[PDB]
Design a protein around this nucleic acid. Sequence first.
RNA 1: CGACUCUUAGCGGUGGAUCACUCGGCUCGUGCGUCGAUGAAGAACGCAGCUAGCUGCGAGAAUUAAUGUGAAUUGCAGGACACAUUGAUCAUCGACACUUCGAACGCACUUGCGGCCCCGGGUUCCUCCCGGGGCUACGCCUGUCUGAGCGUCGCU
RNA 2: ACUAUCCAGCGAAACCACAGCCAAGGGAACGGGCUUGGCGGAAUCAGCGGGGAAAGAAGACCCUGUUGAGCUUGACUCUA
RNA 3: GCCUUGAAGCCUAGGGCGCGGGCCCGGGUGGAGCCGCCGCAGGUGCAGAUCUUGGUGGUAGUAGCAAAUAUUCAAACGAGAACUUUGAAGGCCGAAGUGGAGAAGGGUUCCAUGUGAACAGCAGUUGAACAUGGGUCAGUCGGUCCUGAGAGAUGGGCGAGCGCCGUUCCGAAGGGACGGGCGAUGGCCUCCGUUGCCCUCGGCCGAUCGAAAGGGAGUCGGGUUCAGAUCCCCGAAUCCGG
RNA 4: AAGACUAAUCGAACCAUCUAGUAGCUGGUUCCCUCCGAAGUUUCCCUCAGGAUAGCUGGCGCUCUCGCAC
RNA 5: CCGACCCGUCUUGAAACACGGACCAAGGAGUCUAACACGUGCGCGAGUCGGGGGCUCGCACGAAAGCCGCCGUGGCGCAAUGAAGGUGAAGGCCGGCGCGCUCGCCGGCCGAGGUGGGAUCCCGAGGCCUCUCCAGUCCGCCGAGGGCGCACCACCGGCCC
RNA 6: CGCGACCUCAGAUCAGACGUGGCGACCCGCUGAAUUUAAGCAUAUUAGUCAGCGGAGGAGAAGAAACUAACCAGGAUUCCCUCAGUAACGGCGAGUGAACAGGGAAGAGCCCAGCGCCGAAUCCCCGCCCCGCGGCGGGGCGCGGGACAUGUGGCGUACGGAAGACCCGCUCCCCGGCGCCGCUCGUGGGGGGCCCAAGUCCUUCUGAUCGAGGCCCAGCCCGUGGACGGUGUGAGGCCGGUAGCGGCCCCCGGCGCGCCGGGCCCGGGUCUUCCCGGAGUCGGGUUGCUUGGGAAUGCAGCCCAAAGCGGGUGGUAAACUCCAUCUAAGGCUAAAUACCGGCACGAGACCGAUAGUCAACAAGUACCGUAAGGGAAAGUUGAAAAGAACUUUGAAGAGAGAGUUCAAGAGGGCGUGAAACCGUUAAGAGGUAAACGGGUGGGGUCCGCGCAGUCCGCCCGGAGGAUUCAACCCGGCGGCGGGUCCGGCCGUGUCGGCGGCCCGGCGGAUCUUUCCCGCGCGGGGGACCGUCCCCCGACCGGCGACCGGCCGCC
Lengths: 134, 265
Amino acid sequence: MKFNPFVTSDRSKNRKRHFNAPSHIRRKIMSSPLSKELRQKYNVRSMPIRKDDEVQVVRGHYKGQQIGKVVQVYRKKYVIYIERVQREKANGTTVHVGIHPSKVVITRLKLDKDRKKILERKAKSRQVGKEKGK
Amino acid sequence: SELAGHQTSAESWGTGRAVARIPRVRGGGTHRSGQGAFGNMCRGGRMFAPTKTWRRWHRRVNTTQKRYAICSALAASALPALVMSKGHRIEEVPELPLVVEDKVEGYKKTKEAVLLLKKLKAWNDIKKVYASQRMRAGKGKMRNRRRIQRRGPCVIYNEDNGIVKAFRNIPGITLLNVTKLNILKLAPGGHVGRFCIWTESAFRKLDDLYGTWRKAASLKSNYNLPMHKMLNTDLSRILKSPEIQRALRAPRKKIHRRVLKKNPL
RNA sequence: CGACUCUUAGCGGUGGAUCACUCGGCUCGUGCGUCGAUGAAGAACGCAGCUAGCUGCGAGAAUUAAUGUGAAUUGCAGGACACAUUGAUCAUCGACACUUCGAACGCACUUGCGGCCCCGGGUUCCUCCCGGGGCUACGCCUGUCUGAGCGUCGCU
RNA sequence: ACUAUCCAGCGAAACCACAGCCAAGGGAACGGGCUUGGCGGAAUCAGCGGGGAAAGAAGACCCUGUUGAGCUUGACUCUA
RNA sequence: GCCUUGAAGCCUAGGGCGCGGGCCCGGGUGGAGCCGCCGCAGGUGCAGAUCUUGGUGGUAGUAGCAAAUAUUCAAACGAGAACUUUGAAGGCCGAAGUGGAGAAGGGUUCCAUGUGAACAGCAGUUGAACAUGGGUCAGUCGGUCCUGAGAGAUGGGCGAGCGCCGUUCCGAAGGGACGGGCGAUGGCCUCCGUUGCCCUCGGCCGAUCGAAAGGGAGUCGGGUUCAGAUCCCCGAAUCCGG
RNA sequence: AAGACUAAUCGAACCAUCUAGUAGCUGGUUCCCUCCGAAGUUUCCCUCAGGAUAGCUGGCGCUCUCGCAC
RNA sequence: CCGACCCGUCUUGAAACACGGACCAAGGAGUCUAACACGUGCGCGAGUCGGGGGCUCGCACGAAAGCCGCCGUGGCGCAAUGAAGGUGAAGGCCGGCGCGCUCGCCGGCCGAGGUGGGAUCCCGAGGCCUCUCCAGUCCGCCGAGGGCGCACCACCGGCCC
RNA sequence: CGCGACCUCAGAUCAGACGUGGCGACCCGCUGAAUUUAAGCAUAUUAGUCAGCGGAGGAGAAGAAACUAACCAGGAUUCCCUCAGUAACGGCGAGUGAACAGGGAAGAGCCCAGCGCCGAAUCCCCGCCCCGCGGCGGGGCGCGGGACAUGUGGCGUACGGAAGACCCGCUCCCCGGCGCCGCUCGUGGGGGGCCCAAGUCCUUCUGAUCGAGGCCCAGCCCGUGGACGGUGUGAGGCCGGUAGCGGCCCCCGGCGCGCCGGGCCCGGGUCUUCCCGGAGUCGGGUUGCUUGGGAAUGCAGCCCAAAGCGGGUGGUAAACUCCAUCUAAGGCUAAAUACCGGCACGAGACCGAUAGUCAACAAGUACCGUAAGGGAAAGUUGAAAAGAACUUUGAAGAGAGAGUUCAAGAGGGCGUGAAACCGUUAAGAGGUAAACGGGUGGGGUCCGCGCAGUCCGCCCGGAGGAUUCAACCCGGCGGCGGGUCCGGCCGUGUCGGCGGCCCGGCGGAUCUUUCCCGCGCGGGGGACCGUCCCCCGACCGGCGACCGGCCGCC
Ligand SMILES: [Mg+2]
Ligand SMILES: [Mg+2]
Ligand SMILES: [Mg+2]
Ligand SMILES: [Mg+2]
Ligand SMILES: [Mg+2]
Ligand SMILES: [Mg+2]
Ligand SMILES: [Mg+2]
Ligand SMILES: [Mg+2]
Ligand SMILES: [Mg+2]
Ligand SMILES: [Mg+2]
Ligand SMILES: [Mg+2]
Ligand SMILES: [Mg+2]
Ligand SMILES: [Mg+2]
Ligand SMILES: [Mg+2]
Ligand SMILES: [Mg+2]
Ligand SMILES: [Mg+2]
Ligand SMILES: [Mg+2]
Ligand SMILES: [Mg+2]
Ligand SMILES: [Mg+2]
Ligand SMILES: [Mg+2]
Ligand SMILES: [Mg+2]
Ligand SMILES: [Mg+2]
Ligand SMILES: [Mg+2]
Ligand SMILES: [Mg+2]
Ligand SMILES: [Mg+2]
Ligand SMILES: [Mg+2]
Ligand SMILES: [Mg+2]
Ligand SMILES: [Mg+2]
Ligand SMILES: [Mg+2]
Ligand SMILES: [Mg+2]
Ligand SMILES: [Mg+2]
Ligand SMILES: [Mg+2]
Ligand SMILES: [Mg+2]
Ligand SMILES: [Mg+2]
Ligand SMILES: [Mg+2]
Ligand SMILES: [Mg+2]
Ligand SMILES: [Mg+2]
Ligand SMILES: [Mg+2]
Ligand SMILES: [Mg+2]
Ligand SMILES: [Mg+2]
Ligand SMILES: [Mg+2]
Ligand SMILES: [Mg+2]
Ligand SMILES: [Mg+2]
Ligand SMILES: [Mg+2]
Ligand SMILES: [Mg+2]
Ligand SMILES: [Mg+2]
Ligand SMILES: [Mg+2]
Ligand SMILES: [Mg+2]
Ligand SMILES: [Mg+2]
Ligand SMILES: [Mg+2]
Ligand SMILES: [Mg+2]
Ligand SMILES: [Mg+2]
Ligand SMILES: [Mg+2]
Ligand SMILES: [Mg+2]
Ligand SMILES: [Mg+2]
Ligand SMILES: [Mg+2]
Ligand SMILES: [Mg+2]
Ligand SMILES: [Mg+2]
Ligand SMILES: [Mg+2]
Ligand SMILES: [Mg+2]
Ligand SMILES: [Mg+2]
Ligand SMILES: [Mg+2]
Ligand SMILES: [Mg+2]
Ligand SMILES: [Mg+2]
């Protein structure tokens, strides 16, 4: 249950903030989980997604274990574009198909300076969380 | 609002014209020129009897009554039949005025909570709640009233040391403090049974709150319980006693009906 | 057997009721309680590669710098961005900049007329012409400067 | 002579309880509808103006209202 | 408790109930929520009100498309011609015009190319419609200047007060200038203006506004564009100021 | 000089507000079954298209009693 | 086949030659507060009410709930009357000191007075059925008659201003 | 004949500051109505109200008695309850209408002038040096200018007191600058930023699951977290978030200890003088508006116009006297209170696209008007555009095919898709306009026959087959009932024991005040009375308050 009186718990206000958020927030909302292996090694559960991450699809028509990469992150509509998932149009031209990132599993990352930094803060937060709860 | 229908500057076209004598709008090159205004009928007008804010929303009720009822709800919290009828799966608890050690005021973890109720056989009412979790029927979904469910049992304690944060999360359970009881939680909906759970320290000090018959409260400054109007309700046991049966006439079970007149002549 | 008229049902039309949804209102309450001559409130005109409106902004004009974050914006284009020179886009907001009217302030509302000091062509001040910059409102307070009086006296 | 009339093409309105053959009788005392008799046969075209107590304008004539306003004076109370 | 193995709502020559209010089943459509019991509460049940808002009929393929004399023949573009265009013939306006130019007002309607949905109360290959592009050139033509009937600030007066009266009326009302003297001034301090005065003459008599027909110096001819000319090019002049 | 004109308006323009002005007077007032069931008359009113007063009507009761040998 | 004039409304009286009404869907008209009178329901009871405020919850509920030397400051009630000053609701019976004078002084007893009507209650001769005589204790009911008499009504009388 | 002055007075693009206008819900001051009610109307009421003109703040205003009262007296102002629908006003008619006292929220008091003392002991501006500079200050030196005696600063204001004698007293408070340290109740002052638990597990529908079912217990896992929202249906465990006296970083606060500068040398008990204090003002006439204020509550104009043991008040005019109570005509002040505009936030027994703001959408927009001004209509493809390629007729518009989608019986104003009104098809009928009620007939559309509907159940009789038990005994288990009340509990109701009454407290308009505590008293003691509770005995009501017995029955 909730106890704090300075935030909302109201249907209309959640939706309004969601459908009118700026981009530096849509990044977090457009987060996606990891696989079991990566969780174990890094001791983390979720990262925001990027443009050369390797991913699977879990739910829908295009689920299966075929693995692909990310191509384009159309935040304005809360979707992403994978390389092989695509359909033919009337003319005989292939085009991509958007899918929400909650429905995908990341298998390989795209690391760099900032993204290593980000993982470490998540690790230490959970670490003291376990050691102090326990 | 106070102004709903009185933004305009309308005036009636009089008689002599083949329209029906209500106020109408002044001029223009719009749709809304000679339409209709100022009335419960006319589109864009005002409600009948604007709902005012100095309605009488609240109520006062005499103190002695509220104390009486609090006493009544506790009574029927015993008497298994009433609990059954209020829909509480209860047929495995070992005693109905259910009482436990005063240790459980110091629990802090929901696992200690849940494990306990399993042993005292109060988990079947809880499963019943989970089953009931469903959705509401009406416009209350738009108005932050979207889900609903049953009420579960109620725990009454005296001194807090973390019991609340254990039972806080389990649904349908509400916590009460014996010093500050409430009718809206012991008789939800207006009816009278509810499956309540006590502790020792709470259960003992009820004599000191609401008095016995012989003495009085000592925490309320003047309150002696309500007196019975009719001691023995065992009606069948009465009417079957010898004393009354000696003082009766005979019954008359024979039954007489519409006789058909035949003609003697 | 025909047309035509009437009734009922099936299907197709016209028209937009009911039903289900909702980034809007109304009502109550909590906290704070801040405009401007250092030029307000409001008005006008303008600014996008493709752009009319709404929205945002002011000739540095759909936004600059500086911090926080950390790989996009997107209807089409074209290019940039190397994220271990560092730093796309977003949000914030402490530096900088902020057209014409308007209390509106050189005189007047046509955008018409001027006056003073300074720089640069006008030559080498010497005056006419051109550009450019800074001043040029009413009332009022303290003090300075120059002044008026058959006002009250003193003095030679 | 221009129309009205017919054909091609485009194309409105006011009005409309339901509707639309007559005599007499009674009735809120002058009925398309009731009663007793006369009678009764698809769908329509140009006209004319007897009826529909035909359409328009909540009767300006008359009365009432303890509803008004313009004008006058020797009405009443006040005033520049 | 019911439910994507199908909720609400809607339709129904179907089966049935209740004196009635009303309801339960069956079939079709449709696509996500809904109901029964005990209590609570109310913006709670329509045939009308010359009711309000929206929509649709008979009327009705009707009344009508009649003020100002008038059209015809052929050819061309084109899917396509009573109405466009070219030619020819017959006719009207009849110089106080159905002609050629302008003020007030309108504001891109102007000019070319393309289109034929909508509009042009019939039609249209056309259009003042739709779309895309282009177009207004001044020392001398007008404004700007002056004042007119008149409007209107200052000083003053009055007024609860935003303010009003009034325009020479109860005002130390012009910074106006000038010839001379005084020291200074930068330029070769010659010649100057100058910031400064001492002198020196000073009336005006009321700020300001007010006319694209009143008053107010001076430009004419020829040629040139899809569309502009006293403005552009050619050629001949002229006013003002220094 | 006609009671004529003052933006299609004049025997006192138009715009907003006071303003949901007042109305003893006209027109309208939303489901069912059961039960009881009227007046248009008295006196007073600057009363005569209207109110007060009594009468006519309904509902809620209560004190008694009887074929209960009275 | 018989019956059968179009709904609403005003009216002594409407099928009307009395007004309204072409047709369909949606909206649409006896309310909220403040005060009073009575009737009903609940609680306490010569008393009864915390509504203003304060002590405990940060308020998820819940702007709730509980509590108070406030516990009664106070309001309505328990006492009326008069313009006001002001006064302010019970008797008797018996015996002692003055003459029962429609009258003043010492001691006991009862006590909200009485008349009439009055739901119920009380006492009760003689018994109603006892397979017979007498004795005959528990129990109904009778029923002669006779008493204690609730509320309420009519009257008499008394007390206060 | 130049200088000092003011009676005084103008000027300057002089050096340096300032004011104007806008919003206007709450606030302060003026001005100020008519509808309406009175069943008519003129006083009254509506109303000191709408409209109108000014002026402000985060609150404003008021405010520390020229009071209330008549008491055994209280003691600034402001809000609440109550006094009270009262006293009083009133064509005494409709109608109006307060204060004190009492109980609460909050609570804080103080400066001048004039008398009187102190060598004007006082202020502003320019110049120079040093600290500090973005709410321009501090310290020092100028025979540097100026204001002021037509009165600047210290002491001191009626609390009644205040100044000048006599004895005690023990002698730090502030600001100007420069460092420090502990995060400071909702249980962490403020703001900003980044982070923190657990299933996408097996079987199965579907167009896709967040569905149904199962995982030692709603089952696996978490749980101080099961609020909300999003994702191709409904999600505690997919994502963001949520709870947490959870963590990391940045700035702004304030609360206090250090170090120099400068100020201030600044108290209280017994005698002689001071003040008695604020003028066109009180007050009195006459007039007008207002008030509950009535032989005039308050306010304003004009006339008259004061006193100093005086003046004012003391709710009926005037005189004569006794009392009580305040000290006007100068000034300032926080808190308790108000808030339909503004900036941010949360919530709802509210409306759900003819409703609710006029405004859910490019709305104060389009548009009407010469101007003031008036002022709308208008929500929904689908999960995703995958938004109908190619063939073919036609000048094109429109069509037949094909294709996408679970679905186009979802095709760019495309959720569903009523009624009136139309087109067509099937059936039926037709000279007293149509429609209507009761009663029957005929025909069609559908439901159920069954392609017999012979309906079903108990006991007895008969012929056929078949496999357990029961009948009766024994063993264990469970339950009902009982009373010779078998033994024991427990519970009541008074009693017996006062037995807890001090081995336990609560109260008392009973005494001891036999005591004390600080001195007529406030409290604990000591008795006393009642009221809650201890040990054994009893019986009713042993009752529906429980055992171990024995007995019978099932
Ligand atoms: Mg409305
Ligand atoms: Mg519903
Ligand atoms: Mg719709
Ligand atoms: Mg004709
Ligand atoms: Mg006839
Ligand atoms: Mg006749
Ligand atoms: Mg007729
Ligand atoms: Mg005729
Ligand atoms: Mg009439
Ligand atoms: Mg009339
Ligand atoms: Mg009359
Ligand atoms: Mg008039
Ligand atoms: Mg006269
Ligand atoms: Mg859906
Ligand atoms: Mg409602
Ligand atoms: Mg209604
Ligand atoms: Mg209707
Ligand atoms: Mg009706
Ligand atoms: Mg014709
Ligand atoms: Mg013609
Ligand atoms: Mg021409
Ligand atoms: Mg011409
Ligand atoms: Mg012209
Ligand atoms: Mg046409
Ligand atoms: Mg043209
Ligand atoms: Mg001029
Ligand atoms: Mg001219
Ligand atoms: Mg005349
Ligand atoms: Mg009305
Ligand atoms: Mg009438
Ligand atoms: Mg009348
Ligand atoms: Mg009648
Ligand atoms: Mg009549
Ligand atoms: Mg009728
Ligand atoms: Mg007739
Ligand atoms: Mg009528
Ligand atoms: Mg009609
Ligand atoms: Mg309706
Ligand atoms: Mg009552
Ligand atoms: Mg101002
Ligand atoms: Mg009147
Ligand atoms: Mg009247
Ligand atoms: Mg009148
Ligand atoms: Mg008044
Ligand atoms: Mg006002
Ligand atoms: Mg103040
Ligand atoms: Mg009272
Ligand atoms: Mg008044
Ligand atoms: Mg008081
Ligand atoms: Mg207090
Ligand atoms: Mg969901
Ligand atoms: Mg969820
Ligand atoms: Mg998570
Ligand atoms: Mg006076
Ligand atoms: Mg008055
Ligand atoms: Mg004072
Ligand atoms: Mg003040
Ligand atoms: Mg709508
Ligand atoms: Mg709708
Ligand atoms: Mg709307
Ligand atoms: Mg479908
Ligand atoms: Mg669909
Ligand atoms: Mg549709
Ligand atoms: Mg049909």
